[PDB]
Structure formats: structure tokens, C-alpha cells
Design a protein around this ligand. Structure first.
Ligand code: BCL
Ligand code: BCL
Ligand code: BCL
Ligand code: BCL
Ligand code: BPH
Ligand code: BPH
Ligand code: U10
Ligand code: SPN
Ligand code: NKP
Ligand code: NKP
Ligand code: OLC
Ligand code: LDA
Ligand code: LDA
Ligand code: LDA
Ligand code: FE
Lengths: 281, 302, 241
């Protein structure tokens, strides 16, 4: 079944691999070579998680946890029950995620649109790879990666953070958080603004984009404009994820101490470190 | 390299846009400001005009008084030494009254009284700004979505500084005014309440915060991807669906099996973001009033 | 072992389910009900019902939009099914660029210009927009325009500007026969000595759909122009070297 306007877009072409061999849809879903690849990677990964659950002895999705190898395995392979399943599942996840991005690219090409969406998605993939690949490799062990379980991966976040004291003091983490908060602020404002113009007050014609500009100028003295706000949402969200990756790739690789110490610099500058009074005196 | 419409290639400039009048009291609207070529590489170059008005002036005044009450406290914590002031700027903290003072307003000025005074000014500044977000929409005949979404943020701030301290019986429970101190407050809060990772409203709040970055990356990239068909002119695309809106929908229908409309994606957007602080405020309000230890509570409820 | 926090979290999840239901139905105000590939109504519409109609009163005397409402493409669609079963591509029966199908598609939008909040045309050639000028970056006016075949299709003679957003939206390009066409700004690369257009080879510029008035462009025309140019990425790819 199709949307009423969809048939005219369902033309052959745009594939990157395989010609017309996979150039078709299953219901709404486009397939393509990378749809087949996604299916293979995801199905195998899910099968292996099921295997791990069987080994673990539970069907409870709140208890299933696939752990990486013990640190002592370093960067080597580990037996299936002792981290090897985690290793193969991580390969399948990476393959599924990259195949998803390349399937989006084929979809972009069939539709004649820009490639911004799979490019943006690649930032999420890179943040994932920072935590399961780049950082564990630099640190010398797969066992520094997070486990695949609904609650155990949160415990990994907590244990990793508190290895460095209050992780709030990581300055790249601070920047990342500021982008996440600002992004959610901008998303709320953007959604509200468009809706407040399309759904004006009762008894009123639909507003125009000039009303949106005027509203934001009246309110704060500046309107970034309709093109600008979509650029800005993309920038804020991607920057949040970039600084997330940054704040972890440096932790345990070039920073080993309590993150609060990083700030001890500005305090202990020689021309004011010894001045009595204040907090640090 | 194919052009990507992240930065403008050719800026153009014309007469300042004075805006819509509708029912705006033009007596309270400033003149136009200068144009910024720097800003024009990424968005609009025009600065101003801005609306003043009684609520805005009240909000600005109370907001500066809040900022200055903290600032004078910092100058006193620094012994009025400008170098100690810059050095420890992030370490100073205007703290609420100690627990012995309860909800009393008789805490000495240096032992919590100044915190109450600052909070009074902050309370007046935020709520008059809220009235401003409502009245600026009303004066232009627009819906009230911005005011309603802002109330969600206000809700978390009210819970943290006002509602939860009252229910817990002391101002000592509130957040201090300092850069590092309010981070320490946040870490301590989770430790005291048995790990906020196990507060299901905190887990929801994170899902919506991550989901807000997910959705704005999706939506911002989608609109840029269809800006070659005029896609960012969303209101006229709602009024009169064009190939931009059709291609944007079909990208997502072909990718994940369902899709939005030009109007409806902004309902997804506003709810994704608003739910961050709606769930977050519920989760904080329950902490210590109802649930002392989220991890233990969670073990007995699942 | 069922306190206020328990009641609250179960209540929130019920609320969230109702919210997702509401949001999904709101996002069915265009394109639904679903169709079979022959255009008749599909038997399977899924578990979410069609939203009940809402109305927008459009400004400037432009009328009233009711959605959902009876949908029609309002244009002939030169494609043919390639398979009896569902799910396969539909192949262009003619020239997909000229016929506006595939990534060359356009929608039958209103054949009137978009207007600003004051009821004036939103987009205007700079030569008719008092005081508008290039304020930063390379001014493209006078530059040759090159296609993906590395050959010159014309020269830029004006910039069409979105007045309220102060934004360049189209380049007006004069062709060898002295007529002009509009090129979307998002589909050109302004360089120091040329404007380059990846999407079209030089021989496809005259096929860009023309505008009926020299100082305004209708929403219908913009859709035809922008669809045609983007369609070149697929359909002029034999000439991209
Ligand atoms: C949510 C749980 C915690 C909390 C946890 C964190 C954590 C964890 C982090 C922050 C971070 C920040 N928080 Mg905090 N924060 C809380 C509540 C608040 C409140 C409030 C009214 O309740 C305020 C004003 C702030 C303010 C701030 C900023 C200092 C900073 C970036 C915020 C941001 O992105 O805003 C989005 C908004 C905008 C972009 C609009 C502009 C906002 C302006 C700039 C805020 C100014 C605040 C204050 C007046 C600044 C004084 C600076 C100089 C000392 C003069 N927090 C609660 C108590 N907050 C990050 C940081 O960098 O900390 C150092 C960080 O890592
Ligand atoms: C006690 C714990 C510590 C702490 C320790 C850590 C640690 C440790 C880390 C963070 C990281 C983060 N922290 Mg911190 N953090 C603390 C307190 C906070 C506070 C706060 C208000 O106090 C905030 C707001 C944050 C904020 C953040 C972000 C900046 C960042 C997480 C987002 C991210 O990386 O996305 C990146 C996004 C992803 C990884 C998602 C990738 C998704 C993939 C590509 C696709 C999945 C598809 C899926 C399988 C499909 C399923 C099926 C379909 C749905 C049908 N922290 C405290 C002090 N924080 C993390 C970080 O930066 O990681 C890079 C991190 O590792
Ligand atoms: C990003 C930095 C940290 C991290 C820190 C945290 C913290 C802290 C919290 C979560 C929370 C969650 N995280 Mg985590 N998490 C990380 C990495 C991941 C990855 C990944 C492959 O990289 C995935 C799939 C998840 C998935 C999840 C969900 C179980 C939950 C809600 C996320 C959400 O809505 O996001 C936004 C995305 C969407 C709204 C889209 C839909 C996403 C759905 C919900 C994904 C389902 C995943 C599925 C259950 C497991 C695999 C799929 C099957 C095997 C096919 N996290 C890393 C290690 N995550 C929260 C929670 O409640 O945990 C119990 C929480 O409090
Ligand atoms: C060690 C720290 C603890 C912890 C302690 C807390 C505490 C405590 C809280 C949070 C809260 C939050 N945490 Mg936690 N958190 C931890 C781990 C995490 C991790 C992680 C990767 O592990 C993540 C991603 C998060 C993420 C989050 C967010 C989802 C949520 C805050 C939402 C928001 O927008 O607030 C920011 C938005 C606001 C504060 C609203 C501000 C509105 C006001 C009106 C603004 C006034 C501006 C003022 C006048 C200045 C104006 C300046 C002008 C610009 C000029 N936390 C660990 C386990 N977290 C909050 C929450 O909701 O919890 C349920 C909270 O209170
Ligand atoms: C970079 C900015 C943000 C971003 C952007 C973004 N994400 C995206 C996109 C974009 C632009 C997409 O196009 C794509 C999409 O299609 O969205 C609908 C996607 C997407 N982001 C998703 C999730 C997601 N994004 C996240 C975050 C972010 N996405 C960033 C904040 C998060 C978190 C935790 O914050 C999550 C959970 C999906 C909905 C989707 C990608 C779907 C996909 O890859 O599908 C193919 C794979 C499968 C169907 C299943 C694979 C199964 C594996 C083989 C096994 C499981 C392995 C896994 C590691 C276990 C994890 C256990 C957890 C308990 C930890
Ligand atoms: C839905 C949840 C998200 C959200 C939404 C949201 N916030 C909002 C809104 C919405 C919908 C608004 O409508 C409102 C707004 O107007 O945004 C533009 C607001 C807003 N959210 C703000 C901040 C904010 N929101 C945050 C969070 C979030 N907001 C969530 C993530 C955060 C954090 C901690 O993450 C912050 C800090 C403001 C930008 C604005 C509310 C404005 C307000 O209440 O102002 C009162 C104060 C003043 C008018 C003046 C204060 C003075 C300053 C402290 C500075 C002094 C300046 C100078 C250095 C001079 C000193 C000398 C002088 C004499 C010159
Ligand atoms: C203006 O414009 C805009 C629009 O429009 C006008 C829009 O819309 C949108 C889009 C945004 C929305 C519609 C808003 C809502 C979006 C969110 C809240 C973001 C979060 C979204 C989700 C959580 C949905 C995620 C859904 C996914 C990833 C789809 C895949 C899920 C399934 C198929 C079912 C569950 C999956 C299971 C059980 C495990 C996975 C199974 C596999 C083995 C792999 C599946 C592989 C595929 C689907 C790809 C291949 C396809 C097929 C069929 C392969 C089979 C082929 C063979 C022959 C082998 C935006 C941004 C926009 O700005
Ligand atoms: C050059 O120096 C001068 C003097 C000029 C300065 O001005 C320097 C200024 C500074 C150095 C400013 C420094 C300021 C900060 C560091 C501020 C940082 C603030 C935060 C991090 C805020 C964290 C969260 C605060 C919260 C949650 C506040 C909640 C407020 C309450 C909801 C309000 C409750 C109201 C009360 C208790 C009063 C009761 C009154 C009624 C009317 C009911
Ligand atoms: C006890 C715990 C419950 C929470 C306590 C109160 C918290 C305050 C939060 C308010 C609700 C969150 C914002 C609502 C969603 C965003 C707005 C929206 O989409 O609806 C508004 C819409 O109609 C338009 O308004 P009108 O123009 O007036 O019709
Ligand atoms: C599968 C179904 C499960 C149902 C479970 C029971 C229902 C629980 C309740 C949850 C539903 C909450 C939905 C909130 C929608 C609020 C919409 C709104 O605010 O008004 C309607 C809106 O357009 C008008 O806003 P505008 O047009 O933007 O002015
Ligand atoms: C007197 C001059 C003082 C100038 C001080 C400027 C203060 C910062 C304001 C805006 C930043 C960007 C706001 C981003 C949120 C925008 C919400 C939105 O959708 O805007 C769309 C666009 O503006 C129309 O359609
Ligand atoms: C403009 C001031 C607003 C007053 C509201 C806040 C009251 C706090 C009073 C502080 C207590 C001081 N004193 C003298 C009782 O010790
Ligand atoms: C549109 C106007 C306001 C919308 C209502 C948003 C509040 C709904 C909150 C759900 C309540 C769940 N809980 C935990 C409080 O029980
Ligand atoms: C958890 C957030 C994601 C919400 C998922 C909403 C799913 C709606 C799927 C609608 C199906 C549309 N269809 C194919 C019937 O046309
Ligand atoms: Fe938008």
C-alpha cells in the first residue's frame, strides 16, 4: 500500500550496489542491497543475544546482559560465553548500523534529496564506536566497553563516571551537556513556534512566517529564520554528540585523575594561588 | 563539492523588516538594530527590534537584581579582592539556609537570608518572563504553544527550588547559586536518593533528552535535504503540500515504515522536548517525599 | 508495594500510549487513506484511524484547507507498473524529466506566488526589490553557468530573493536563445569565475520549466523548476563525467 502521493516517486534507480537486483519495497520499507545487509546483521546479532540469554539462564529482557571480555583478555578474542558473543554482536551491530546509513543514502538518491540525514546518523554511529571500539582499543582492552543490558549498561556509566570522581567536572562533558540542553530548548521553541503560527488563536487566519519572525524579535530581539533554525538544530544535536565522543575518548587515555583537578589549574596560577581568602585560600 | 546549505554562499541584504503589527502595542517596540554579516552566514543578519513593555522591564529588573545579589555575595566571599574574585569565580556559592532554619524567613542575611532574597528576585523574573511569552503571542494572534512549552521547563525549576524544599520542610534542600556548587548539589542528590539512574522518571527524562537530539538531528537534516525544493517554508507547505514535504515523508516511510507531515513533525518535536522536564520534574518531586532510595524501590517493584 | 511513585509511573505510561496514538493520527492528515498501486483504496489501513478533519483559514483571501480531505494528484502521472504484485518500481513511460516523475516530480501546488504577511509576493528578482543587493560572498551576476558536462549553459543575470528572509533563492540564468530560467540556490556552487551546476548538463537547461511572468514565480512553477533540477542527479548521470 502507498500514500496517495507516493506512486510517482517509486521509480527504479539510485542504488549503490547490486543494480536493480534489490530495488524494491516490502510494504512501506525500501529494501536495496543494504536492506538485505541490515536484515542479515540484525538477525544474526539478535540470534546471538538469544544464545547469550540461554547461557545466562533468563528470558527476562530486564536481566539479559551480554558482557564484554574480562580486562585480562586485552584486545584478543574471547570464548563465546566469556565475551566472545559480545564481540561478535558488536560486529553485527556495527554492520547493521552502517548498512542502515548506506540504505538511507540509496533512499536519498532515489528521491533526489540531500544526504544530510545519513551524514547526521553517522555521528551517532561514531559515538557508539567511540565507546565500544576506539576507547577500548586505546585503553588496551575490550573489557572497557559497555555491556549490552538494559540496566547493566547504566551501571557501567555510573562505575565509569565515578572512576574519575564527579564526572560533571569533565570540561568536554560540560560542553556536551550544554549542547544537549540547548538542543532540547531549541526543539521545544521551534515546535511551539511553527505550531503557534499554523494553529493561531481561535477566530484567526493562519499566521505567516513573518509572524514567527516578529514573535521571536519581540520576545528576544532576534529571529534566526526558517532556514537558520533547521541548520541550528542539526548543529546543536551533532555538536552534543561530538563533544560526548570527545569527553570519553580522552578519559582513561590522556586523563587519568579526578576530573575536578583539571580546574585546579586556574585556581593555582602563581599570581593568585597564595592570596588569602576566597574559597581556595 | 556539492553544496550542502549549511552556510550561506551569497548573502543578500535589503531594507530592515519592521515586522507584523497586528495588536502589538508599538509604543513598547524598540527601533531596528544593525545587521550582522557574521550571523548572516548561518541565519538572518538583522538584529532587533525588541519588545519592551511592563512585564519585560519588570523581568529584566528582577533578573538583574537576582544576578547582582549573587554577584555581591561573591564579591564578599572574595574579600572584595578582584583577583580572588576571578580566581574562585566558579567556586563561590550563595547557599540556602541551613536545615535548622526550616522554611523560616528569619535566617541571618549571611547564613541563607541572601539566598531567599535572590530566589525572590529569580521567582519574579521567570514568572514575568512567562507572562511575556504568552502576551507576545497573543498580541500577534498566535497560538500559545511557546508559553505552554515554557511552563514545562518552569515546572522542573519550581520543583527544584520551591515545591520540593517546601514539602521536605526546609529551604536547605534547594539548589545553591554557584557554578560548581550546583553540580555538587546534583551529584549529592543522586547519592542521597539511592541512585537516580533507578528513578524511572529520570530514565524517561533521559530518553526524551536523547530523543530530542535524535529528532532535531532527523528533522534539521530532513529540511536541509529538501531545502532544494523550498522545504524550510514549512507554513506554506502545511497550507499547500509540495514535493519537499512529500519527499521528506517518503524518505522516512521508506526508511522506518512510517512518517510525519509538515505540521505533525512539529507536534512530535514539541512533545519530545516538553516531556524532558515534565518527567524530570515528577521524578525530582517524588524523591525524598515519597521514595528515599530509588534502587531499593525498583528492586521491590520489578 | 504500590505507592504514589508506582501509581505515577503506570499512569505516565498510559498517558504516553495515548499521546503516541494522538501524534500518529495527527501525522495522517496528508497521504491517507493508503492506496493500492492502481490508485484504488487499500484494504489494509493499519491500526490507527484516520484523523477527523481540521480546517486552516488561509490569509489573503486564499480560501480554506481541510485535512484530511479527498486526495488526488491533480496531474497525469506517466509511469507504468513493472510487476503484477506489489512492491516493485513503476517505470517512466516517457521522458521522466519532462513528465515530472521520480526524483523529477512536482506537486500540483497553487498556481499563485507565496505571499508575505503583508500580502506581497515573497520572492522577487533583485531588479524589482528596492535596495536589495549582494552584501557578502561572491556576487554571481554576470558569471557563466556550467553544467555537469563542463560546458557553459548561460550566464547569471539576476538573483531572485526571498524578501522577508533576506535570502537568495534562485539564480536567473540567460540561455543562448535569450530566454531565462530559474536555478535553485541550493543546487548551485558559486565559484570565483563561474556558477557550477552538478545536477544538469548544459543541454538540459532549456528544458527547465519556464515562468509565465518575468517578475514573479508561482508555487506551482517553483515545484516544477525545483523538481526538474533535482531530477537531473538521476537522469543526467549518463553525462556526468
Ligand atoms: C538538571 C540537573 C541540575 C543541573 C545540572 C547541570 C550539569 C550536570 C551541567 C549543567 C550546566 C549548566 N547549567 Mg545546571 N543544572 C540544574 C539547574 C540549572 C539552572 C536552573 C534555573 O535550575 C540554571 C540557570 C543552570 C545553569 C547552567 C549553566 C551554568 C550550564 C549550561 C546550561 C544550559 O545549557 O542551558 C541551556 C540554555 C541556554 C543556552 C540559554 C542561555 C543560558 C545561560 C548562559 C545560563 C546562565 C546561568 C548563570 C547566570 C551563569 C553565570 C556565569 C558567570 C558566572 C557570570 N542549571 C539542575 C539543578 N547543569 C553544564 C555546565 O557547563 O556546567 C558548568 C553542565 O555540565
Ligand atoms: C554517575 C554517572 C556520571 C556520568 C558519566 C558518564 C559516562 C561514563 C558517559 C557519559 C556520557 C554522557 N553524559 Mg554524563 N554522567 C553523569 C551525569 C550527566 C548529566 C547530569 C544532568 O547530571 C547529564 C545531562 C549527562 C550527559 C551526558 C551526555 C553528554 C553523554 C550521553 C549522550 C551520548 O553520548 O550520546 C551518544 C549516543 C549514542 C552512543 C547512541 C548510539 C545509537 C546507535 C548508533 C544506534 C542504536 C540503534 C538501536 C540498537 C536500534 C534498536 C531497535 C529500533 C529502536 C527499532 N551526564 C554523572 C556525573 N556520562 C556518555 C558519553 O559521552 O558517551 C559518548 C558516557 O559514556
Ligand atoms: C548514550 C550514553 C550511554 C548510555 C546511557 C544511558 C542512560 C544514563 C540511560 C539510558 C537509557 C536507555 N538507553 Mg542507553 N546509553 C548508551 C548506549 C545505548 C545504545 C547504544 C547501542 O549505543 C542503546 C540502543 C541504548 C538504549 C537505551 C534504552 C534502553 C533507554 C532509552 C534510550 C532512548 O530513548 O534514547 C533516545 C532514543 C529514542 C527515543 C528512540 C528509540 C530508542 C529505543 C528505546 C531503543 C531500544 C533498545 C533495545 C531495548 C535494545 C536493543 C534492541 C534489540 C536487541 C533489537 N543505549 C551509552 C552506553 N542510556 C535510559 C534508561 O531508562 O535506561 C534503562 C537511561 O536512563
Ligand atoms: C551524579 C549525577 C546523577 C544525576 C543527577 C540528576 C539530578 C539531581 C537531576 C538530573 C536531571 C536530569 N538528568 Mg541526571 N544524573 C545522573 C546521570 C545522568 C545521565 C547519564 C549519562 O548517566 C544523563 C544523560 C542524565 C540526564 C538528565 C536529564 C535528562 C535531566 C535534566 C533535564 C533538563 O533539561 O534539565 C535542565 C533544565 C532545567 C533545569 C530547567 C530550567 C528552567 C528555568 C526556568 C530556566 C531559568 C533561567 C535563568 C533565569 C537564567 C537566565 C539566563 C538568561 C539566559 C539570560 N543524567 C547521575 C546518576 N540528574 C534532573 C531531572 O529532571 O531529574 C529527574 C535533575 O534535577
Ligand atoms: C547524532 C545525534 C542523535 C542521533 C541521530 C540520528 N539517529 C538516527 C538517525 C539520526 C539522524 C537516523 O537516520 C536513524 C533512524 O532511522 O532514525 C529513525 C537513527 C537511529 N537512532 C536509533 C537509536 C538511538 N539513537 C540515539 C541517539 C542519537 N541519534 C543522537 C543523540 C540513541 C541514544 C541512546 O541516545 C538511540 C537508542 C534508531 C531508532 C535508529 C537506527 C536504527 C538502526 O540502526 O537500525 C538498524 C539496526 C537494527 C534494526 C537492530 C540492530 C540490532 C543489533 C545487531 C543487536 C543489538 C546491539 C546493541 C548494541 C545492544 C544495545 C543494548 C542496550 C540496552 C544498551
Ligand atoms: C522544554 C524544556 C527545555 C526548555 C524550554 C523553554 N525554555 C524557555 C522557553 C521554553 C519553551 C521559553 O519560552 C523561554 C524563552 O524565552 O526562550 C527564548 C525559556 C528560557 N529558558 C532559558 C534558560 C534555560 N532553559 C533551560 C532548559 C530548558 N528550557 C529545557 C531543556 C536551561 C537549562 C539549565 O538547561 C536554561 C538556563 C532562558 C533563555 C529563557 C527564560 C528567560 C527568563 O525567565 O528570564 C528571566 C531573567 C531575565 C529577563 C534577566 C536575567 C539577567 C541575566 C542573568 C544576566 C545579566 C547580564 C549582563 C552580563 C549584565 C549585567 C549589567 C547590566 C546593567 C548591563
Ligand atoms: C518534515 O519532514 C519530516 C517528515 O516527514 C514529513 C518525517 O517523517 C520525519 C520523521 C520523524 C517522525 C515520523 C517522528 C517520529 C520519530 C521518532 C520519535 C524517532 C524515533 C523513531 C523510532 C523509535 C522508530 C524506529 C523504527 C525503525 C528503526 C524501523 C525498523 C523497525 C522494524 C522493521 C520492526 C521492529 C524491529 C525488529 C523486531 C528488529 C529489527 C529487525 C531486522 C532483522 C532488521 C529490519 C531491517 C529493515 C526494516 C530494513 C530492510 C527492510 C526489509 C523489509 C528487509 C527484508 C528484505 C528481504 C527480502 C530480506 C522527519 C524527521 C521530518 O523532518
Ligand atoms: C562584576 O560583578 C557583578 C557584581 C557586577 C556581578 O553581577 C557578578 C555576577 C555573578 C558572578 C553572577 C554569578 C551567578 C551564578 C553563578 C548563578 C548560577 C545559578 C545556577 C547555576 C542556578 C542553579 C539552579 C537554581 C534554581 C533551581 C533555582 C530555583 C529558584 C526557585 C524556584 C525560586 C523559589 C523562590 C523562593 C524560595 C522565594 C519565595 C518568594 C515568593 C514570592 C514565593
Ligand atoms: C502533578 C504532575 C503534573 C504536572 C504539573 C504541571 C506541569 C506544567 C506543564 C504543563 C504541560 C506541558 C506543556 C503542554 C504541551 C505543549 C503545548 C501544547 O502542545 O499544547 C498547547 C496547545 O493546546 C496550544 O495552546 P492554545 O493556543 O491556547 O490552544
Ligand atoms: C492506543 C490508545 C491508548 C489510549 C490510552 C488512554 C488515553 C490516555 C490519555 C492520553 C492522551 C493525551 C493526548 C494529549 C493531546 C493534547 C492535544 C492538544 O493540546 O489539543 C489538541 C490539539 O490538536 C490542539 O492544539 P493546536 O491545534 O496546536 O492549537
Ligand atoms: C536587541 C538585539 C538582541 C539580540 C539577542 C539575541 C538572543 C538570542 C536569540 C535567538 C537565538 C536563536 C533562537 C533559536 C530558537 C528559535 C525558535 C525558532 O523556530 O525560530 C525560527 C525562526 O526564527 C523563524 O521561523
Ligand atoms: C526585595 C526583597 C524581597 C524580600 C523577600 C525575601 C525575604 C528574605 C528575608 C531575609 C531575612 C533577613 N532578616 C533580616 C530577617 O534576617
Ligand atoms: C495541553 C495542556 C497540558 C497537557 C497535559 C500534560 C500533563 C500530563 C502528565 C501526565 C500525568 C502522569 N502523572 C505522573 C502526573 O501521573
Ligand atoms: C517510541 C516512539 C516511536 C513511535 C512509533 C509510532 C509507530 C506508528 C507506526 C504507524 C504505521 C503507519 N502505517 C504504515 C500504517 O501507515
Ligand atoms: Fe521545522
Amino acid at each position: 500500500a502507498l500514500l496517495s502521493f507516493e506512486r510517482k516517486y517509486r521509480v527504479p534507480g539510485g542504488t549503490l550496489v547490486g543494480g536493480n537486483l534489490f530495488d524494491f519495497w516490502v510494504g512501506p520499507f525500501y529494501v536495496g542491497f543494504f536492506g538485505v545487509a541490515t536484515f542479515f546483521f540484525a538477525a544474526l546479532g539478535i540470534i546471538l543475544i538469544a544464545w547469550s540469554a540461554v547461557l545466562q539462564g533468563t528470558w527476562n529482557p530486564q536481566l539479559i546482559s551480554v558482557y564484554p571480555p574480562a580486562l585480562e583478555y586485552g584486545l584478543g578474542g574471547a570464548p563465546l560465553a566469556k565475551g566472545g558473543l559480545w564481540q561478535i554482536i558488536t560486529i553485527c551491530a556495527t554492520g547493521a548500523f552502517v548498512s542502515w546509513a548506506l540504505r538511507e543514502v540509496e533512499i536519498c538518491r532515489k528521491l533526489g534529496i540531500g544526504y544530510h540525514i545519513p551524514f547526521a546518523f553517522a555521528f551517532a554511529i561514531l559515538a557508539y564506536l567511540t565507546l565500544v571500539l576506539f576507547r577500548p582499543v586505546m585503553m588496551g582492552a575490550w573489557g572497557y566497553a559497555f555491556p549490552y543490558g538494559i540496566w547493566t549498561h547504566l551501571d557501567w556509566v555510573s562505575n565509569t563516571g565515578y572512576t574519575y570522581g564527579n564526572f560533571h567536572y569533565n570540561p568536554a562533558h560540560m560542553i556536551a551537556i550544554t549542547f544537549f540542553f540547548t538542543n532540547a530548548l531549541a526543539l521545544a521553541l521551534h515546535g511551539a513556534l511553527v505550531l503557534s503560527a499554523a494553529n493561531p488563536e481561535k477566530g484567526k487566519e493562519m499566521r505567516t512566517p513573518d509572524h514567527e519572525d516578529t514573535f521571536f524579535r519581540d520576545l528576544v530581539g532576534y529571529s534566526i529564520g526558517t532556514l537558520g533554525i533547521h541548520r541550528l538544530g542539526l548543529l546543536l544535536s551533532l555538536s552534543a554528540v561530538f563533544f560526548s565522543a570527545l569527553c570519553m575518548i580522552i578519559t582513561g587515555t590522556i586523563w587519568f585523575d579526578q576530573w575536578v583537578d583539571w580546574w585546579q589549574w586556574w585556581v593555582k596560577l602563581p599570581w593568585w594561588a597564595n592570596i588569602p581568602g576566597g574559597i581556595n585560600g | 563539492a556539492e553544496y550542502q546549505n549549511i552556510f550561506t554562499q551569497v548573502q543578500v541584504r535589503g531594507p530592515a523588516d519592521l515586522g507584523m503589527t497586528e495588536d502589538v502595542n508599538l509604543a513598547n517596540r524598540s527601533g531596528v538594530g544593525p545587521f550582522s554579516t557574521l550571523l548572516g552566514w548561518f541565519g538572518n543578519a538583522q538584529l532587533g527590534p525588541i519588545y519592551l513593555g511592563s512585564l519585560g522591564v519588570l523581568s529584566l529588573f528582577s533578573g538583574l537584581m537576582w544576578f547582582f545579589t549573587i554577584g555581591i555575595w561573591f564579591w564578599y566571599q572574595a574579600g572584595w579582592n578582584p583577583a580572588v574574585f576571578l580566581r574562585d569565580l566558579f567556586f563561590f556559592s550563595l547557599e540556602p539556609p541551613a536545615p535548622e532554619y526550616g522554611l523560616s524567613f528569619a535566617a541571618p542575611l549571611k547564613e541563607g537570608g541572601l539566598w531567599l532574597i535572590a530566589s525572590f528576585f529569580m521567582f519574579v523574573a521567570v514568572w514575568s518572563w512567562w507572562g511575556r511569552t504568552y502576551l507576545r503571542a497573543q498580541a500577534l494572534g498566535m497560538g500559545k504553544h511557546t508559553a505552554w512549552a515554557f511552563l514545562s521547563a518552569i515546572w522542573l525549576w519550581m520543583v527544584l527550588g520551591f515545591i520540593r524544599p517546601i514539602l521536605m520542610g526546609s529551604w536547605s534542600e534547594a539548589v545553591p547559586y554557584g557554578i560548581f556548587s550546583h553540580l555538587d548539589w546534583t551529584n549529592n542528590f543522586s547519592l542521597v536518593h539511592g541512585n537516580l539512574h533507578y528513578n524511572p522518571f529520570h530514565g524517561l527524562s533521559i530518553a526524551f533528552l536523547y530523543g530530542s537530539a535524535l529528532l532535531f538531528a532527523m528533522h534539521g537534516a530532513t529540511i536541509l535535504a529538501v531545502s532544494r525544493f523550498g522545504g524550510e517554508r514549512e507554513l506554506e507547505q502545511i497550507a499547500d503540500r509540495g514535493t519537499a514535504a512529500e519527499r521528506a515523508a517518503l524518505f522516512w516511510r521508506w526508511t522506518m515504515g512510517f512518517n510525519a507531515t509538515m505540521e505533525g513533525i512539529h507536534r512530535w518535536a514539541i512533545w519530545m522536548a516538553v516531556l524532558v522536564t515534565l518527567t524530570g520534574g515528577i521524578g525530582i518531586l517524588l524523591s525524598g517525599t515519597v521514595v528515599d532510595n530509588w534502587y531499593v524501590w525498583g528492586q521491590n517493584h520489578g | 508495594n504500590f505507592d504514589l511513585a508506582s501509581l505515577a509511573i503506570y499512569s505516565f505510561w498510559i498517558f504516553l500510549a495515548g499521546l503516541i496514538y494522538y501524534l500518529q493520527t495527527e501525522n495522517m492528515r496528508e497521504g491517507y487513506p493508503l492506496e493500492n498501486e492502481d490508485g484504488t483504496p487499500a484494504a489494509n489501513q493499519g491500526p490507527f484511524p484516520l484523523p477527523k478533519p481540521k480546517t486552516f483559514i488561509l490569509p489573503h483571501g486564499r480560501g480554506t484547507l481541510t485535512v484530511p480531505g479527498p486526495e488526488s494528484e491533480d496531474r497525469p502521472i506517466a509511469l507504468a507498473r513493472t510487476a503484477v504484485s506489489e512492491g516493485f518500481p513503476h517505470a517512466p513511460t516517457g521522458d521522466p524529466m519532462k513528465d515530472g516523475v521520480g526524483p523529477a516530480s512536482w506537486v500540483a501546488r497553487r498556481d499563485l506566488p507565496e505571499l508575505d504577511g503583508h500580502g506581497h509576493n515573497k520572492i522577487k528578482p533583485m531588479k524589482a526589490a528596492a535596495g536589495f543587493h549582494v552584501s557578502a560572498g561572491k556576487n554571481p551576476i554576470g558569471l557563466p553557468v556550467r553544467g555537469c558536462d563542463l560546458e557553459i549553459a548561460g550566464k547569471v543575470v539576476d538573483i531572485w530573493v526571498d524578501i522577508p528572509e533576506q535570502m537568495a533563492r534562485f539564480l536567473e540564468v540567460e540561455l543562448k536563445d535569450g530566454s531565462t530560467r530559474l536555478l535553485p540556490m541550493q543546487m548551485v556552487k558559486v565559484q570565483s569565475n563561474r556558477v557550477h551546476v552538478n545536477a544538469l548538463s548544459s543541454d538540459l537547461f532549456a528544458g527547465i520549466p519556464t515562468i509565465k511572468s518575468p517578475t514573479e514565480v508561482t508555487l506551482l512553477e517553483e515545484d516544477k523548476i525545483c523538481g526538474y533540477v533535482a531530477g537531473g542527479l538521476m537522469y543526467a548521470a549518463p553525462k556526468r563525467k
